Enzyme design. Structure first.
Site, PDB file in Angstrom:
ATOM      1  N   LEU L  41       0.831  -1.194   0.000  1.00  0.00           N
ATOM      2  CA  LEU L  41       0.000   0.000   0.000  1.00  0.00           C
ATOM      3  C   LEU L  41       0.871   1.252   0.000  1.00  0.00           C
ATOM      4  O   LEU L  41       1.981   1.260   0.531  1.00  0.00           O
ATOM      5  CB  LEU L  41      -0.958  -0.006   1.195  1.00  0.00           C
ATOM      6  CG  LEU L  41      -0.478   0.145   2.637  1.00  0.00           C
ATOM      7  CD1 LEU L  41      -1.629   0.653   3.465  1.00  0.00           C
ATOM      8  CD2 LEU L  41      -0.002  -1.173   3.217  1.00  0.00           C
ATOM      9  N   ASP L  42       0.368   2.313  -0.628  1.00  0.00           N
ATOM     10  CA  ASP L  42       1.186   3.488  -0.893  1.00  0.00           C
ATOM     11  C   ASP L  42       1.384   4.330   0.361  1.00  0.00           C
ATOM     12  O   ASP L  42       0.769   4.110   1.406  1.00  0.00           O
ATOM     13  CB  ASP L  42       0.570   4.352  -1.987  1.00  0.00           C
ATOM     14  CG  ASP L  42       0.735   3.754  -3.357  1.00  0.00           C
ATOM     15  OD1 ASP L  42       1.703   2.990  -3.547  1.00  0.00           O
ATOM     16  OD2 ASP L  42      -0.081   4.067  -4.248  1.00  0.00           O
TER      17      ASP L  42
END
Ligand SMILES: CCCCCCCCCCCCCCCCCC(=O)OC[C@H](COP(=O)([O-])OCC(O)COP(=O)([O-])OC[C@@H](COC(=O)CCCCCCCCCCCCCCCCC)OC(=O)CCCCCCCCCCCCCCCCC)OC(=O)CCCCCCCCCCCCCCCCC
Lengths: 59, 119, 68, 128, 55, 176, 171, 56, 60, 157, 459, 87
Positions: L41-42
């Site tokens: 996830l960013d």
């Protein structure tokens, strides 16, 4: 009982001991503003009747 | 009120100014209308310590109200009849002042505009 | 068990100074007030006579309080 | 969009609309790196002398001593009397004094003439 | 950790809501009359208090 | 304005813009559900054009976003009541007495509190015990003559504690 | 005691209320309770102390002075006359300040007695106040602070010269 | 009426005992909030009377 | 010797001492004089404190 | 101890080495050292800063003096006494300063102008004077026990 | 009065033939006994002052200042150790004997009779102060401080001798009654203008006025604590006392020529309250505070109301005690940290928690606490000057605001907000410092209880 | 104002509101995970996590500690440092 006994009997005794003799030997001292006498009455001390209030109609 | 809007927007001629009211002389549309009983016993009014601007009309009703409040003090809610009666009397006094105002207003309007609109 | 240890700057010097101050006023605070109490409860203040016929006093006898 | 936030001598200029920071060159990178080097060396020397339990005294800022000895003693050298300094001094030393001097003259002359005619409120003005 | 079951706070809040319910009337009603109670208003001059609150 | 670099960077600067705009949108929007809506609209509005490999267009749009943030922020943003600016800001500093003192006492009170003071004495004996060698050896060896950073490496080599630890470990508790 | 000639009190007025209530009467029970809780034991201890004062009694007198010749009857400089004259004048200044204090205390007592209608049986004491204080204002006021008695006599000569010129222009 | 003056001056002087007491104490009171609260409550109950006398 | 014989002794010495610049004496002196001039007709505090027989003026 | 070289004698000339020596001693960059200049107002050759500096300086750096905003080596702008928090807040404003003073002066003059409009235009409720009973309530005004009874009566209206 | 003079002589060889650790207790104990002995003085009554001889007399302008001198001596003596207690015994004996000689000529000065004797004992007051501040000034410019001190006070107070000799051999002797009882109102020629300006300008230099107020602050930041307290309290209120003595003559022309000094004092009070707001070096704040209060005293003297004179001497006694105390707390702070600066030692509510109470009480009595003597002083001065002119109340009130502000900032700079947590040498409060605070602040509050002592000759 | 807090309880609460966040799989939720490395996830979602911490616990964590947590173990250690979570 000794707690509130001393706190509300000792200062009142000492202040009222302070507020007779010193307070009257200082002559111009604590002075009341006079009780408002009303015309249907009499003076409690000397004693004579104030003649009551006059004619009521046109109400 | 609405009278104030009329006094400011309309003619300032016909309007009596408050606190400079008496302009037309007395005994004009009055005559022989004065009794002014005023039975307040002004010396007893002096002896009983009453407030300035309470040394006025309907004084004796205030005298009776103070008398009953002194007579029954722990009766906290007793004197309300005499309270309302004294209120009623000075309401009548306010009515009297209103009517005096409007009488001088009608006099000034009708007289000045009759004279300056036919003469 | 539950409680942490609080940090304090110092207490000993300050409590010592306050006890020394109240005590070394108390050392002649109590005897002085008991002395002025016994004076105005035993010996009297004064009363208020006038100057009699040709009895000239000293520079004292003109004052209310007796220690005055 | 926005009238660009003109600053003032009171209003600070926040870091967003500088717009000088977004003009990145090698000058700014090198100067900020050397500024980090200076703060690094100063905090390094401070944290070196800061932690000795053998030490008892204070850490003795030379910048505090420097600023105080500037602002206290080293104000008088240097000085030359310049027209800027002399005119600003003659305004800030004589001006308000001659002003309230004139107003004390005027108020006292009014009061002296008003009591010379005697039409004052000294009906009972005992506590003079 | 919302706790209000405290005897001191409920006593003090109780006593001041009593002071906010009865004591205004008690202190207000047995005053010695020193001023002139006006009481003689037209319409929409006495009604305006409740009018302002409701609006 | 940091220990680890000189400038911050571009990406964390944009990230600070994101976090402040998110904070001010909390401050602007009560009732929290329409706030969640506006926050996702903000997440999409910033995720319009991530893939722009142009640098100067990205910082141009960044400065435009700073203009739009500054015209659209809130005057009294919801700051936290432990942060500076907020309500606390060393609220309980009344009992943050520094620990170099508490030894200038009369030993009557040290007789009152024996075991804490014995353990504090062995703390200070550890402090002087492991003071000179590893600490000042790594301070005058492991950096360059211009050290050019603020952080220190740990004393990982052989023995004792990572250097300069006294006024960092032994600090007050922030809520006494 | 205190001399009621110099400290006048108006005679008393006290009404006679009589309820006309059935609560009845909290403060009557409470004033009897205050009397029996304070007024008796303090007076008993005071009676003990008054007997102790009646053991033996001191006396103090009022200090008495003579009259000096004058300041207007000394010679040119001759200090050992003017010293006596100016000390007698300084004592007149002190007793005059206490006279003004007495009149002001009487006025405050009239204000507190006579209630909200001030202007009935206080206007007479207000009138005697304006009398004595217009006298003191024209007599001792504008002389500053480095007086002995000579500035007062200079003021006196100047004021009566002003009155002489006043009747000169009048008649 | 010396009752009125006595009650008012003791409503004054009740608010002199706590401060002078802990200046004279040089000890730790553990019920000192309780003590301040009860002297204020007794000051209220001594000041409630003369107002009733006043309007009476 | 700095508090217990100094402070409380000075407190006694300045708490009561004689009529410093004549307080009580001036009170009773003014009382006697106002009694005199209220029981003897003339108004209290006659102005012109020197007797105008005992004065002379340079003429015009 | 302390040497007189650590005070500040004279201004910026001569131009390479005195700027160099000031940057060495004041712990600064060469070109970042910018004097006042030598204006004749004394001032030595003390440095100059961007003047606001105290609601700047984000405290999450955690420098040494937490409320004095020192760093033990910063040159400490000449007006630092005026700068410290609890004396002057030089925060960046939410809108402007000119726009704020325009609207505040206009609002205050606006309220006092409507006040003057009120002062010349009164309201009241339309009713004559309170008719006082006895010679405009004589003997309870300023005095006059028998001096000047000034006659007036009222009429039943 | 020789019963006061001669034991202070005989107290000097005590310190000579008393040994190590034995000069101290003897000097302290016996000077406290002499303080009792002059507490016995207060006999003043009615008609005039007390003549203690052909040679001495005691006014009610003189009695409280003399009590202040003979009470401020032992407080000073216990105050002035730990900065020379480690030093040599002979130098210590020289220091203490110098202070006793100083006190002796101070009593000579306050109870003077002829104004020539007053002038000789005035500069006899001057000469020990020089040697004290220069020998123990403990900073690099004590040289320049003492040099300005001596040259300002002599060069201002030089022609006052000539004017006193002139008034002597034109109008007889110089005792205050024959200085009084004979002095004519002197007319307005320019010679009378110079004689008035000579006397008044000499004391203007002494107080200081604002025109020569830079006399003071070097000689307060560069003086030891005994010389500091002596200088501030006793020398400046001695200058005011001498002005009150001399100003009985030349009263007609002072309304003509007193107008610029009132203005210079008022605008100088304003500017001095402004300058003591932003300075570092905490010690200097009390010095410019003293300049502000003495400007207020100078206004109070050149207006000539009995209200003004009573308020003037009350302000004298009050600021003498307050500035001497606050100097002693500044000495406490400098014994804590070897700084003399202001922004360095912060915090200090935690550390020494009862030092807070004495700084608060000092800043209250400087703050004009409303039953304190300082507010008595400023109040009667403002009443008399509003009687003088109706518009001078604005500068007095701006003074009041800035006075409260700098007193509060002086309070909460040093002893409020955050300890700098790198000091680690301050010790808990000695018994000595709290003893000295208690010796300052009990007589001030006692005189606040019954101030019928300390008001002026025109009580 | 005094909850007795500990390492285990606040560890479980941090892990709880990490697990409550939907688009990471609660099957692969180790304490020694990483918010960029193993779950992918960013960083923007990591700042969403940061604001979730600050809204549950009510104290700022600054910009200098925004880059450098990146794993729940150091989040638990940093919160235990900041609140001083001990008896
Ligand atoms: C004669 C009868 C009285 C004799 C009193 C002797 C001293 C008593 C004593 O030892 O008290 C302990 C007391 C310290 O007790 P503590 O609780 O152990 O220490 C608390 C801390 O030091 C913190 O100090 P603090 O908070 O106690 O001090 C604060 C300070 C703050 O000062 C004020 O508030 C005074 C101004 C009030 C308004 C005036 C208008 O003083 C006061 O609160 C005094 C209030 C009473 C003043 C009026 C009487 O001593 C002091 O405070 C020092 C003396 C202060 C001056 C007293 C003046 C009395 C007149």
């Amino acid at each position: 009982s000794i707690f509130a006994f001393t706190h509300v009997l000792i200062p009142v005794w000492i202040i009222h001991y302070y507020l007779k003799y010193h307070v009257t030997t200082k002559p111009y001292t604590i002075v009341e503003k006079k009780p408002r006498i009303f015309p249907g009455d009499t003076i409690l001390e000397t004693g004579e009747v104030i003649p009551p209030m006059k004619e009521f109609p046109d109400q | 009120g609405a009278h104030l809007a009329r006094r400011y927007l309309g003619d300032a001629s016909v309007e009596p100014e408050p606190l400079r009211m008496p302009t037309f002389p007395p005994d004009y549309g009055f005559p022989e209308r004065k009794e002014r009983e005023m039975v307040a016993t002004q010396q007893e009014m002096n002896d009983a310590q009453l407030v300035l601007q309470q040394r006025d009309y309907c004084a004796h009703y205030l005298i009776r109200f103070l008398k009953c409040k002194r007579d029954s003090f722990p009766n906290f809610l007793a004197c309300k009849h005499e309270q309302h009666d004294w209120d009623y009397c000075e309401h009548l006094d306010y009515v009297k002042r209103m009517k005096e105002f409007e009488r001088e207003r009608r006099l000034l309007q009708r007289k000045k505009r009759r004279e300056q609109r036919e003469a | 068990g539950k409680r942490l240890f609080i940090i304090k700057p110092s207490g000993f010097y300050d409590k010592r100074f306050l006890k020394l101050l109240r005590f070394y006023i108390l050392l002649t605070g109590i005897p002085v007030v008991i002395g002025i109490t016994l004076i105005n409860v035993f010996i009297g203040e004064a009363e208020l006579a006038e100057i009699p016929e040709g009895y000239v006093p000293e520079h004292w006898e003109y004052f209310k309080h007796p220690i005055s | 969009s926005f009238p660009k936030y003109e600053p003032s001598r009171l209003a600070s200029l926040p870091t967003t609309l500088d717009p000088a920071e977004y003009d990145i060159s090698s000058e700014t990178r090198k100067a900020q790196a050397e500024r980090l080097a200076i703060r690094s060396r100063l905090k390094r020397e401070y944290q070196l002398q800061y932690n000795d339990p053998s030490r008892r005294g204070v850490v003795e800022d030379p910048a505090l001593i420097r600023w105080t000895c500037a602002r206290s003693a080293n104000v008088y050298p240097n000085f030359r009397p310049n027209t800027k300094t002399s005119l600003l001094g003659a305004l800030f030393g004589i001006g308000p004094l001659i002003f309230w001097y004139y107003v004390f003259k005027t108020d006292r002359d009014r009061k002296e003439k008003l009591i010379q005619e005697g039409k004052l409120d000294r009906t009972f003005n005992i506590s003079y | 950790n919302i706790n209000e079951n405290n005897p001191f706070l409920i006593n003090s809040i109780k006593r001041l809501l009593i002071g906010s319910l009865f004591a205004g009337f008690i202190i207000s009603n047995n005053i010695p009359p020193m001023t002139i109670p006006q009481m003689t208003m037209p319409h929409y001059l006495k009604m305006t208090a409740l009018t302002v609150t409701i609006l | 304005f940091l220990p680890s670099a000189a400038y911050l960077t571009h990406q964390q600067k944009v990230l600070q813009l994101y976090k402040r705009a998110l904070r001010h949108l909390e401050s602007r929007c009560v009732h929290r559900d329409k706030y969640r809506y506006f926050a996702c609209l903000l997440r999409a509005r910033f995720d319009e054009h991530k893939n722009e490999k142009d640098m100067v267009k990205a910082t141009q749009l960044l400065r435009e976003a700073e203009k739009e943030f500054w015209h659209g922020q809130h005057p009294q943003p919801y700051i936290f009541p432990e942060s500076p600016g907020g309500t606390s800001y060393e609220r309980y500093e009344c009992y943050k007495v520094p620990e170099w003192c508490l030894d200038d006492w009369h030993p009557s009170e040290k007789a009152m509190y024996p075991d804490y003071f014995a353990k504090r004495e062995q703390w200070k004996k550890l402090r002087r015990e492991s003071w000179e060698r590893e600490v000042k050896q790594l301070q005058e060896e492991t950096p360059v003559g211009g050290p050019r950073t603020e952080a220190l490496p740990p004393a990982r080599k052989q023995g004792d504690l990572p250097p300069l630890w006294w006024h960092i470990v032994t600090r007050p508790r922030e809520r006494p | 005691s205190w001399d009621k000639d110099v400290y006048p009190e108006p005679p008393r007025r006290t009404p006679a209320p009589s309820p006309q209530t059935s609560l009845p009467n909290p403060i009557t029970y409470l004033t009897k309770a205050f009397d029996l809780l304070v007024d008796r034991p303090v007076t008993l201890v005071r009676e003990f102390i008054e007997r102790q004062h009646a053991k033996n009694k001191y006396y103090y007198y009022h200090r008495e002075f003579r009259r000096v010749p004058d300041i207007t009857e000394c010679h040119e400089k001759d200090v050992l006359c003017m010293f006596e004259a100016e000390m007698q004048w300084k004592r007149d200044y002190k007793v005059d300040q206490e006279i003004v204090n007495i009149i002001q205390e009487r006025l405050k007592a009239c204000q507190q007695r006579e209630g909200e209608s001030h202007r009935q049986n206080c206007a007479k004491e207000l009138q005697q106040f304006t009398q004595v204080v217009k006298a003191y204002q024209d007599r001792y006021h504008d002389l500053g602070a480095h007086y002995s008695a000579r500035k007062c006599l200079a003021k006196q000569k100047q004021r009566m010269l002003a009155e002489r010129k006043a009747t000169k222009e009048a008649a | 009426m010396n009752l009125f003056s006595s009650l008012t001056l003791v409503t004054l002087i009740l608010l002199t005992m706590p401060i002078a007491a802990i200046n004279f104490n040089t000890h730790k009171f553990t019920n000192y909030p309780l003590y301040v609260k009860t002297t204020i409550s007794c000051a209220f109950i001594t000041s409630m009377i003369p107002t009733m006398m006043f309007i009476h | 010797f700095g508090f217990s014989i100094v402070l409380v002794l000075g407190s006694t010495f300045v708490a009561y001492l004689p009529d410093y610049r004549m307080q009580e004496w001036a009170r009773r002196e003014a009382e006697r004089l106002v009694k005199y001039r209220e029981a003897h007709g003339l108004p209290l505090m006659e102005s012109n404190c020197f007797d105008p027989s005992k004065i002379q003026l340079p003429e015009d | 101890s302390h040497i007189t070289k650590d005070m500040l004698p004279g201004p910026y000339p001569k131009t390479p080495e005195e700027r160099a020596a000031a940057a060495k001693k004041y712990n600064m960059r060469v070109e970042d050292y910018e004097p006042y200049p030598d204006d004749g107002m004394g001032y030595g050759d003390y440095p100059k800063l961007p003047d606001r500096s105290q609601q700047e300086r984000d405290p999450w750096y955690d420098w040494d003096h937490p409320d004095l905003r020192l760093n033990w080596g910063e040159p400490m702008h000449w007006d630092l006494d005026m700068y410290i928090r609890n004396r002057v807040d030089t925060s960046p404003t939410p809108v402007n300063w000119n726009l704020m003073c325009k609207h505040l002066f206009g609002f205050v003059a606006f309220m006092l102008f409507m006040f003057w409009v009120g002062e010349t235009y009164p309201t009241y409720q339309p009713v004559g004077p309170k008719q006082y009973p006895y010679n405009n309530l004589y003997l309870e005004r300023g005095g006059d026990p028998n001096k000047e009874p000034e006659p007036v009566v009222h009429y039943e209206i | 009065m020789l019963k006061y003079i001669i034991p202070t002589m005989m107290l000097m060889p005590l310190t000579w033939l008393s040994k190590n650790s034995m000069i101290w207790i003897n000097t302290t104990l016996h000077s406290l006994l002499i303080s009792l002995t002059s507490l016995l003085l207060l006999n003043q009554f009615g008609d005039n002052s007390l003549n203690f001889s052909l040679t001495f007399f005691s006014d009610s302008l003189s009695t409280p200042l003399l009590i202040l001198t003979m009470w401020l001596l032992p407080l000073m003596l216990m105050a002035s150790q730990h900065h020379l207690s480690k030093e040599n015994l002979a130098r210590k004996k020289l220091f203490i004997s110098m202070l006793i000689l100083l006190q002796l000529f101070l009593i000579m000065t306050f109870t003077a009779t002829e104004l020539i004797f007053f002038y000789i004992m005035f500069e006899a007051t001057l000469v020990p102060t020089l040697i004290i501040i220069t020998r123990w000034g403990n900073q690099t410019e004590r040289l320049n401080a003492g040099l300005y001190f001596l040259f300002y006070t002599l060069a201002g107070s030089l022609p006052l001798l000539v004017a006193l000799i002139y008034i002597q051999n034109t109008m007889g002797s110089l005792n205050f009654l024959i200085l009084q009882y004979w002095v004519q109102p002197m007319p307005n020629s320019w010679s009378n203008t110079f004689m008035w300006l000579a006397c008044m300008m000499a004391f203007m230099v002494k107080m200081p006025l604002y025109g020569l107020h830079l006399w003071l602050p070097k000689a307060h930041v560069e003086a030891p604590i005994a010389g500091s307290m002596v200088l501030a309290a006793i020398l400046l209120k001695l200058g005011g006392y001498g002005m009150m003595r001399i100003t009985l003559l030349l009263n007609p022309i002072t309304d003509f020529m007193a107008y610029p000094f009132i203005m210079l004092s008022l605008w100088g009070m304003i500017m001095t309250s402004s300058i003591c707001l932003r300075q570092t070096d905490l010690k200097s704040l009390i010095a410019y505070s003293s300049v502000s209060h003495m400007a207020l005293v100078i206004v109070a003297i050149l207006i000539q109301t009995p209200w003004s004179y009573m308020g003037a001497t009350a302000l004298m006694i009050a600021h003498g005690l307050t500035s001497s105390m606050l100097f002693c707390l500044a000495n406490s702070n400098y014994e804590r940290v070897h700084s003399r600066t202001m922004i360095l030692a912060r915090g200090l509510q935690t550390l020494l928690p009862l030092m807070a109470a004495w700084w608060l009480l000092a800043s209250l009595t400087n703050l004009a606490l409303p039953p304190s003597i300082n507010l008595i002083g400023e109040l009667f001065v403002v009443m008399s000057t509003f009687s003088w002119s109706n518009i001078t109340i604005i500068l007095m009130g701006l003074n009041m605001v800035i006075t409260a502000l700098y007193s509060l900032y002086m309070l909460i700079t040093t002893q409020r907000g955050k300890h700098t947590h790198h000091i680690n040498n301050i010790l808990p409060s000695f018994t000595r410092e709290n003893a000295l605070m208690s010796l300052h602040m009990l007589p001030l509050l006692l005189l606040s209880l019954n101030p019928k002592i300390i008001l002026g000759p025109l009580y | 104002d005094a909850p007795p807090l500990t390492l285990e309880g606040i560890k479980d609460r941090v892990l709880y509101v990490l697990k409550l966040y939907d688009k990471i799989d609660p099957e692969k939720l180790s304490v020694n995970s990483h918010f960029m490395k193993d779950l992918g996830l960013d960083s923007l979602d990591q700042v969403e996590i940061i604001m979730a911490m600050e809204d549950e616990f009510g104290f700022e964590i600054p910009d200098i500690d925004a880059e450098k947590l990146m794993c729940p173990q150091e989040i638990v250690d940093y919160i235990a440092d900041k609140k001083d979570v001990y008896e």
